[PDB]
Amino acid sequence: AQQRKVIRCWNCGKEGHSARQCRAPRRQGCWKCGKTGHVMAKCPERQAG
Numbered sequence: 001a002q003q004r005k006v007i008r009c010w011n012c013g014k015e016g017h018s019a020r021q022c023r024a025p026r027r028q029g030c031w032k033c034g035k036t037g038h039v040m041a042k043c044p045e046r047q048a049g
């Protein structure tokens with residue numbers, strides 16, 4: 001049904017801008033999984049937590 005989306009703001013995920021202007025608090029360091037300061041460079045990707 002509603003199949004349409006505008007530029008999704010990376011970092012927070014909001015159709016309206018990108019990651020250069022978005023820095024909300026809810027932000028998530030990594031993005032392939034979404035967690036916090038941690039990033040793909042050091043993302044555990046599902047661990048013992």
Ligand SMILES: [Zn+2]
Nearest residue numbers: 009012014022
């Ligand atoms: Zn945003």
Ligand SMILES: [Zn+2]
Nearest residue numbers: 030039040043
């Ligand atoms: Zn991550």
